[PDB]
From a paper:
The human [name]+ [name] p97, also known as [name], a potential target for cancer therapeutics, plays a vital role in the clearing of misfolded proteins. p97 dysfunction is also known to play a crucial role in several neurodegenerative disorders, such as MultiSystem Proteinopathy 1 (MSP-1) and Familial Amyotrophic Lateral Sclerosis (ALS). pmcp97 is a member of the classic clade of [name]+ ATPases and is an essential cellular enzyme. p97 is composed of six protomers forming a homo-hexamer with an N-terminal domain (NTD) and two tandem [name] domains D1 and D2 (1). p97 is an essential protein in regulating cellular homeostasis from membrane fusion, Endoplasmic Reticulum-Associated Degradation, Mitochondrial-Associated Degradation (MAD), Chromatin-Associated Degradation to NF-κB activation (2). Critical functions for p97 include the translocation and restructuring of proteins from large cellular structures such as organelle membranes and extraction of ubiquitinated client proteins to facilitate their degradation through the ubiquitin-proteasome system. Here, we present cryo-EM structural analyses of four disease mutants p97R155H, p97R191Q, p97A232E, p97D592N, as well as p97E470D, implicated in resistance to the drug CB-5083, a potent p97 inhibitor.
In the p97R191Q, p97R155H, and p97A232E mutants, the primary variation in conformational outcome as compared with p97WT is observed when the D1 and D2 domains are both occupied by ADP. In these mutants, the ADP-bound conformation of the D1 domain displays many of the structural signatures observed only upon ATPγS binding to p97WT, suggesting that these mutations shift the conformational equilibrium toward promoting ATP binding. This effect is most readily visible in p97R191Q, with p97R155H and p97A232E displaying similar effects in the D1 domain, but of a smaller magnitude. Residue A232 is located at the interface between two p97 protomers, and the introduction of the glutamate at this position will result in steric repulsion separating the putative hydrogen bonding residues T127 and T436 of the N and D1 domains of the adjacent monomer, respectively. This disruption likely accounts for the increased flexibility of the N-domain and also results in a shift similar to that of p97R191Q in the loop region between K425 and L445 of the D1 domain adjacent to the E232 residue. Of note, a T127A mutation has been reported in an individual with FTD, further suggesting the importance of this hydrogen-bonding interaction for the function of p97. Our results demonstrate that the effects of the N-D1 mutations are mediated chiefly through the destabilization of the N domain in the ADP-bound state, either through a loss of interdomain interactions in p97R155H and p97R191Q or through inter-protomer steric effects in p97A232E.
Numbering used by the authors:
A (entry chain E): 21 to 707, 728 to 775
B (entry chain F): 260 to 707, 728 to 775
Write the structure that this text describes.
Amino acid sequence: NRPNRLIVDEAINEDNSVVSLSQPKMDELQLFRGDTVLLKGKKRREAVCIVLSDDTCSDEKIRMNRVVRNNLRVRLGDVISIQPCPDVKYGKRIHVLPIDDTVEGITGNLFEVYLKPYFLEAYRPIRKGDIFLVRGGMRAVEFKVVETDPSPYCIVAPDTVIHCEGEPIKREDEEESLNEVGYDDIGGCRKQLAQIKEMVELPLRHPALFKEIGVKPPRGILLYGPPGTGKTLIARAVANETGAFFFLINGPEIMSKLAGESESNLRKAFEEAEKNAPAIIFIDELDAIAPKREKTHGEVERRIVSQLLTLMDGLKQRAHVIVMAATNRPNSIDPALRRFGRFDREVDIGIPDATGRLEILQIHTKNMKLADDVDLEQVANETHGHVGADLAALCSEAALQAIRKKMDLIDLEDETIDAEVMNSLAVTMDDFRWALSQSNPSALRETVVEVPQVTWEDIGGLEDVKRELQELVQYPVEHPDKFLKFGMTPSKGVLFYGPPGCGKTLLAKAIANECQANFISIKGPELLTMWFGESEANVREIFDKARQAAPCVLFFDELDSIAKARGGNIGDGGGAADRVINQILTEMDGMSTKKNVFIIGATNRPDIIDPAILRPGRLDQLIYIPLPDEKSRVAILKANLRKSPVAKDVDLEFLAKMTNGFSGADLTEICQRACKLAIRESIESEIVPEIRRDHFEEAMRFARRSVSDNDIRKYEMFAQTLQQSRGFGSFRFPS
Amino acid sequence: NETGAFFFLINGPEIMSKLAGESESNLRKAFEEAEKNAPAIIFIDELDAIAPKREKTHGEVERRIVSQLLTLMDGLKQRAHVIVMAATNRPNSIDPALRRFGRFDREVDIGIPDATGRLEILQIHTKNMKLADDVDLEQVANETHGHVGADLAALCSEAALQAIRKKMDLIDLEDETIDAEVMNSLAVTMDDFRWALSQSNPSALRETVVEVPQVTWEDIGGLEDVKRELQELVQYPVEHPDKFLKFGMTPSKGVLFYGPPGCGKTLLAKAIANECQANFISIKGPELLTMWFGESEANVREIFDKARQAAPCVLFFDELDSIAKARGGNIGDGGGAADRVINQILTEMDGMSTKKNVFIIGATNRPDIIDPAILRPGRLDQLIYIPLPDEKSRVAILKANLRKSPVAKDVDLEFLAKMTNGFSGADLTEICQRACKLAIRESIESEIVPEIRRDHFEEAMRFARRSVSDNDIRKYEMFAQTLQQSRGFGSFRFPS
Ligand SMILES: Nc1ncnc2c1ncn2[C@@H]1O[C@H](COP(=O)(O)OP(=O)(O)O)[C@@H](O)[C@H]1O
Ligand SMILES: Nc1ncnc2c1ncn2[C@@H]1O[C@H](COP(=O)(O)OP(=O)(O)O)[C@@H](O)[C@H]1O
Ligand SMILES: Nc1ncnc2c1ncn2[C@@H]1O[C@H](COP(=O)(O)OP(=O)(O)O)[C@@H](O)[C@H]1O
């Protein structure tokens, strides 16, 4: 029973010590707003924390932080006892004793500079036997007392004094190093860590569950992603925060020894893990271990692969161990390792997007401090092609510029140095600007896979097609019973056409943002490259990665690019069938219907498109996007002008009604050209931050009309051909 | 295990994982120890990585093993009783030297289980536990098509973990010791299987699916004239061989039927496979265009090789004119009507054994651009023309397509069928799908009646499409008279 336990859950707030509760929880423990919560761990220890009351952020979950995880030896999937302590205690005497384990490189008095201007207006409670970290000196040191006033009676108050003895105590191995990598050190990966969280804690946190049940436990997990995404970091964290022996083998040192003992080393590596149960085995790289694709040289390289296959094939129950492997791309792993019982679980981690990169800036900067005008939100927005390790490299090399630009005008060069200056290292905005403009990204030409910020308000007008996309995307994933009962299979994909520059890409991105689903962008040149080069297998990986990145939505921009490059309507003697779209068809037909992977096709010349892709089953839903009317052009202009500063006397209705045959891009280029004039005038006047009517009057003289009446009637003749309201279109049936 | 013989298993990686010099001795002693423990049996888990004498060709260390295996199975005289069993993944990875007589003469192929096969294996991996009364395995194995046998076992195991995770989260029975009186309450619900199956990753999804469909003769509305034709050419030579043999007339090798698109050419081929309790292979248009653009011409060899060994079976070549359409069609370039893929189909069709009950069905919609070389007597001589459905058969088509959907009693189908003149089979099915769209959307909107009324059909009929215009009509009458030719002496009473 005991209806007071709280299950440990993942924390989303990057705060110091705050616990979120529910409305009924205050009335059960009669606790006030700010109280002293007492927690019972094991081995007769207590912990103190600060509770926060909120009924908007969380509903019935706790937010337990890592500052008290190591102070109570409590991990994920464990129960705890909560108890209020309304007793009022004011500490007046405390004892401090540094341990001779991490005091290297630290000189002078560090308490008076790091602890005095940090605990004011904080009232943080402390207890004998707590490990807490501080942010100072471009690092983070720990503290642990061994003899002080009887617990508790410990409150940080200004009346306390300082003292020194000079006789450090020897540390013990009972506790672990809290500085090691944990679950709070990985950001920008919510969906990928969730799968690991829901497959690793079953056979490790509760080993006794699996000796009694006959359920097959997962034995091998394969990690993916470009180099530097953090495959090693995740494996190090999931083993350090679970309580299992982590054994790491890189792979080059396996193959660096003489031929004959590498196999013995690999065998003993697996053998030593079984006795140290629970245990875990992680392989840093696997492509250079089993390159049975194109290398095929020497039995020395095949003996290792055979030994690994033998070692993971014979992994019966016996003990509890999980073999984790990481690589860079699936096209470099021996398929013999992908069989069942060796590597059946494959997880892919992609490039973090703007909301993901900002989440990982903080981990690599929390050890230091910045200025008040320097914000990491904007610095991670315009970058798109940076891997996780690129951010860490950028921060490190920005710190060096900070100190270089600080000591040049000071010239504090002498015999010895003092520790009271390196705490003043503050990174400015220009430091990050120059450091980022100088950084060299690693991966920049991959299929970027991210969820855009674009919403339905970005697309002006087109209210008729918004509901159409909603009713074909959101419905089959929200009401499967209603679709299943009527006995009608959901639409596999939608292709919409129309004149260029009308929001076909924005429509596809909005339906991905609204569904909280992933998005893949395949442009025209991305599809022309695989045609000229006779590289036809490149379409296999697109669908393979889209399927595994579920949920997701495909996008095939300007599918008629091959037809345009081949001649179009007539061209040569050939018809309308090509090789790339042919390979798209056989992969589209082979997709599983249940999976929530949608395909969106975009084109502007449907007359030269392949009729074979129009058949019912692959792309049957067609949406025609006409030119915006006067009603929607005002919305398009005002949506495009939200970011730019626009004056109050700028009338948009007249401007929108003045343009008759103008598409969406024609209105955006007008705004860009108007911004050009304002920027140029502002620069010239330096030797007003607003856009007036004069800027638009001059910009409208350079207006372009890409869609002429030549492009107009090419679509009415197509719409009537596809609709065909003749014969019996509008007739009242007697029955 | 169920015969009473000593089972000896060798994987193959541990054979090649030891130092060079003792692996051959281990393999030899493995064969030698089986003879003394008679009766015995030898099974090799994988053989492609044991004898990769196709493209690897590196080192005598890898050829010594192959030679040792060949020596050990070549010298298997009577002496004792032992059977060497080997498994692999695909025939294109085995040394042909092992396929000789006396080493591996018996080849058996096991395909992907279909809906009736997968349901049969759900029960084995779930009998150890119990489910709820509303959870049924019949429907869960129906919509899946690309799952291997081990995929089902993996899916069940990972659904069980979700069951316990969703059960102990709200209970939190975490203490020092555990009791055995709770794990018997582990019941798997429907949403558990739904999320587990939607999250599973199938292994094989782009193979030639080889299965027997559920489709029957009642699914195809009308076309009573062509049903008997297919019966009399498929079921007869396999049922009365003596009657065919006595008259001295060889059975028809294959049948190609043509007609406008969307008229049941695929369903006709599938029904004749279901009725004969025979296997079925489906080769679509893109499946045939892929082997043409890529200059991969040997891919047609394996199709016929696996069709022959999967006897009884029926072939299907959908839209055979796809290569001609992609090449230009009637005129195109200066070339004629002969290509490479259909050329390789001809040499494989001529080489088939007549006795084997492997039928070939060809489907096309533009017979004017088809290769005349495939029309010759001997390969595809029987031609069936499938015209547009009449008023009599459109009612049957609509009522057959509407069996699954809930249809109200006041929905008249005869008027709807007689209202459409130039509508093919797919034109009637898209109307029903569009009518179901409106009912589903109205049902969802009204949430904030489970039936289809006349209003749903009235609105859906406004969006009706007529794919087959009169442009596509007379292109077939001119062909039918050319092939039939009742002129000169068509209808004349002979005195003798
Ligand atoms: N998502 C991430 N969050 C935080 N740090 C990351 C992330 N991805 C990469 N890093 C940084 O990259 C460094 C090394 O990359 P790592 O992942 O260890 O190698 P690999 O990418 O090959 O697994 C880590 O020490 C970590 O600081
Ligand atoms: N309806 C619209 N609402 C807002 N912006 C639009 C609209 N149509 C076009 N644009 C602008 O034109 C640009 C090009 O639109 P795009 O999505 O590329 O359409 P398409 O791909 O069909 O040409 C967009 O980046 C957007 O700024
Ligand atoms: N005679 C018919 N009876 C039932 N359904 C039909 C019929 N003709 C066409 N259909 C429907 O039209 C769709 C297309 O039929 P299909 O098998 O492709 O024939 P074809 O290949 O000649 O177009 C089928 O999925 C089927 O539901």
